[PDB]
Design a binder for this molecule. Structure first.
Ligand SMILES: Nc1ncnc2c1ncn2[C@@H]1O[C@H](COP(=O)(O)OP(=O)(O)O)[C@@H](O)[C@H]1O
Ligand SMILES: Nc1ncnc2c1ncn2[C@@H]1O[C@H](COP(=O)(O)OP(=O)(O)O)[C@@H](O)[C@H]1O
Ligand SMILES: Nc1ncnc2c1ncn2[C@@H]1O[C@H](COP(=O)(O)OP(=O)(O)O)[C@@H](O)[C@H]1O
Ligand SMILES: Nc1ncnc2c1ncn2[C@@H]1O[C@H](COP(=O)(O)OP(=O)(O)O)[C@@H](O)[C@H]1O
Lengths: 313, 314, 314, 314
């Protein structure tokens, strides 16, 4: 049987996941949503494109969780946009999604995209009852992609020769490690030394990565980023389906690493056929650990606020 | 230097064209639109995705035609949705687009998507002044893709083993030839004989292909198809850029084939580094010819109504 | 767990099978051979190449059949070159390979390449005991590739728009059907009618296809084709592994189709996750049927000679 | 016009270069060789494979240099195998090849593979007269692919997540910098401190990389590596053809960097549409600089012995 990918949410990211899953031949695709017509429509549009590029994949749109039965991978974008209270609405969505995955796809590898990410993934894991190593959040890969793109422009090198090291969440909760970020193995601080850029331009690049999501919103005005997010989650899915062992920053349940337990945090992980196969642990200096703890504190509060709304957690 | 692809219109199809061009490494991409922010945002979004798959391409969003200068391929989706009324607004858009291509990308291979396709490509070729062999419309490839998909489902074979032969435009203007459509070389009427499906099911499949665009609109409610249309236009672009000589049904200027001159009609064509390098003419039986003539006549009616609005087209 | 591909034989075709399996990310690859070092060397060379393109697959060389345990697909090129005595040595190889698959990969999709193909795949099925729908021979896809390529050059169209219909085996045992061969849905005889080529040039292209293997041998002098044969077998394997339902001409066990039972014959088949899922049966006119029966008769003679050598095949 | 890739030498690597150029749709390919039949045979074999995957490319075999005319990229494997009189035979070959490039493809980007690489590329640049930034040697990418592969195994991570930094040539001429080699951005010496590996294992992986070519020869017995070498050279061609700006270790002409002038040394370089666009110069500690100087001196001595065989190089 082909692999089966279920996309819970058929909006801008959802459609893009479907398209990419088709193009990359990851397998059959189920697009789920509460909106009638939307998933069916996008699913049939993508199916109808299949003969052009030559991929053979079933695309199904559905409004019933039974359609996700036996999904090897589930990618969750279901939620509402920030048009505080976002927490309350999206948490109720995670509850519906969790129960749906619990019933129909308990063996799935689950990638959460819904915001606020680190809390929503934490809640989805508990509501679904899936083992934590099989439930992760997409955030870090997106920050890393933006950062790499900015640097590839700064140095006029290939994106393929830029590596960045990122932990935490987005924005002020991101913890970049310049010293573990390189061009062809040469770390960013030495590139500054060599005159390839300046520390001020690197600081602006770092700040632009923090604000990267907001920059896209400012440009589109009517929505947020969807290509790079979608590409990011597909890469995680792909490392699972192909047992690739990529090292990828994702929101994963920590159990002692970095001094944190029972909470999702953005960390470098090795992704393979068993989900999060390994959490990578590096030393952080005082300032790094300062930012790190600050994000954990912020996410702790969101999770507590979620416990407020849903004591079942 | 890399190939340069200019996308005139940065909407649902436009953004998809850009994503596909990035993924397939067809070259650098300019997203153009009149809306500020939109092409800049989609362009940067896609650029930002590029380290994931490792493609190297520049993405630029622009609100100025000068950004398209020297484009090897121009793909046009600029226009407004249908919420003869449409004709007038989109015609004026083809005039602006035409003038920008003439000025900044005169050597471009141009692929028109804007509806109503059959008149807009013909108008766009005139306004722009480009040689007709370098200006085509995307329609046939989409209808063909839908048709093939439905057949692959009916027979449970790979999409790559289904071929269909489509003349004309969308809907009632489509003239599909079942006898030149095949699974692995076996024509559809033979597959009907062998019991692989029935004539009534084949008939419904052709009808579904006619109504294909409207089926997606009914599902989406808020807009129309964009993934299959984009994929279709990108396939045409790619045959040009790679000098592939794919046989693709496109809206092309006829000059004698099928008795038709000075008009764009959907016909299978060989697309290579010189654009429309060959239009394929087959013999039609009397019924098929009558279907083809009705479709061409309806396209001529649309073009004449464009002339009434923009006399410079005459 | 990744798919596992076992290559029984690590010569020219085998090494190409491994390379393509890596490049296309079909899974982990075991190269098996009788020669020590050859499969280990090639496997490590291809593994060392993997960081360039970024594919992650394990490559193992082995001289022990236990290495092939649990293989999803097994591709067999083991044999010796013609340097009816060939039949004898290669039948012994099929017996060893058969026993090794039976013991270690009884659930594999098995693709036979070893010559002479039509007898060897039939012998290999019997020796191995695998269900016949999981054991096929590569042949038709190669004749088909050659033919398509030659036509694509003749007409100067993309290889992607050429389809050919080929029954039987290589050389004089090939039964090509020009009428079920097309460019963009247009059968070759209509293309002759339209002036795209002549009957005499089509006849020559057909004969070139019969002689295709020998033409490569004539050029290389030291051995035979390996790129197109490897590509052809890999396509078959992918259709299985992706459940793609491609229609491919392969040597398959017939059970009534075309009046044939209990023999392997080159026929267009749908290949999916269950192996040979459908064997396509068309009607043949009187001349085509005579050509087909003559081809089947010479395959029956070859199998009878194999029974002569190895009575356990009776 | 499609890109044109000329392959000077149609042996094991040559054939593999051709196949990969086909699969990756890099352009039309000319296989050239002194041996009649070989390049025509390999060329036709690969062309015949092309309808399977659907790439459209011309493959030509030739024994006349005029076939390479206007090549965008020329990759040279022409020479004889190692069975200082090798230096003399292969130098004579570089003379012929250089003269054919000068006459027929003076604007080519040229990639040398012929051994001994460090002298042959230098000598090939001088014979052909091409600008030095357009003539490079393939070496470092190969050592780097092997290195990364061995590391990916030790750490159980994707090959895509390992980066290594290699100066100099193969074997004892290699100068690897563990401190600019990484897993996920984390340098190797730090990984040793973290317990993910030991200095012993790391030293053995370095030594294994130095002996990597000889390890493959010890396994194959009758030949040397060809898959990883071909993949490495193709990555270099591709970065040029796509203006990718990949950072790749290649043998390039230094003009002041690391204190070296008028000599080809393995250094990481930016490769784009103008060939060697930037040679990366880092600071070296005293030990690293001694290793580098010893490697460069041994390259200088080889080139001096070439000047004694062919005084025209002085
Ligand atoms: N309870 C729910 N279950 C499933 N889908 C939901 C639920 N609530 C909202 N959605 C859907 O989630 C999708 C969110 O899409 P969108 O707003 O485009 O954001 P994104 O950028 O994450 O794609 C919409 O298609 C919406 O209908
Ligand atoms: N005169 C014009 N010039 C350039 N772009 C235009 C013009 N008029 C409309 N557009 C743009 O064309 C795009 C059409 O996109 P959309 O409505 O999503 O349809 P489609 O599905 O064809 O992409 C919109 O982004 C709109 O801003
Ligand atoms: N009994 C056997 N078991 C396994 N491999 C065998 C056996 N006999 C021969 N071989 C191998 O089969 C391979 C045939 O390769 P080669 O002669 O290059 O032909 P091809 O073109 O079919 O690859 C060789 O590697 C050879 O050692
Ligand atoms: N003067 C020359 N010009 C062109 N080709 C040559 C010349 N001398 C030798 N060759 C060819 O170079 C090729 C080297 O191939 P091969 O020995 O397989 O080594 P590799 O492993 O580098 O491909 C052979 O095909 C040989 O015929």
């Amino acid at each position: 049987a082909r692999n089966k990918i279920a996309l819970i949410g058929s909006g801008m990211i959802g459609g893009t996941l479907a398209h990419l899953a088709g193009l990359k031949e990851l397998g059959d695709v189920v697009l789920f949503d509460i909106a009638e017509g939307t998933p069916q429509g996008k699913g049939l549009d993508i199916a109808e494109s299949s003969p052009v590029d030559g991929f053979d994949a079933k695309f199904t749109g559905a409004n019933d969780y039974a359609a996700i039965e036996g999904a090897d991978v589930v990618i969750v974008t279901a939620g509402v946009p920030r048009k505080d209270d976002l927490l309350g609405i999206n948490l109720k969505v995670m509850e519906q999604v969790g129960a749906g995955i619990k019933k129909y796809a308990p063996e799935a590898f689950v990638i959460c995209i819904t915001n606020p990410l680190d809390a929503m993934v934490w809640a989805l894991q508990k509501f679904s009852g899936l083992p934590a190593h099989k439930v992760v959040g997409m955030a870090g890969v997106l920050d890393s992609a933006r950062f790499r793109y900015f640097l590839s422009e700064e140095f006029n090198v290939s994106v393929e020769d830029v590596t960045v090291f990122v932990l935490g969440g987005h924005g002020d909760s991101m913890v970049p490690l310049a010293r573990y970020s390189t061009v062809a193995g040469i770390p960013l601080p030495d590139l500054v030394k060599m005159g390839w850029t300046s520390q001020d331009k690197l600081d602006k690049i770092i700040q632009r990565t923090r604000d990267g999501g907001a920059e896209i919103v400012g440009l589109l005005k009517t929505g947020s980023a969807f290509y790079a997010p979608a590409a990011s989650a597909i890469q995680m899915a792909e490392s699972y389906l192909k047992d690739k062992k990529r090292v990828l920053p994702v929101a994963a349940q920590l159990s002692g690493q970095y001094g944190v337990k029972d909470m999702y945090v953005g960390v470098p992980t090795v992704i393979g056929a068993n989900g999060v196969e390994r959490i990578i642990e590096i030393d952080l200096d005082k300032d790094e650990k300062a930012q790190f703890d600050k994000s954990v504190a912020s996410v702790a509060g969101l999770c507590e606020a979620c416990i407020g709304i849903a004591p079942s957690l």
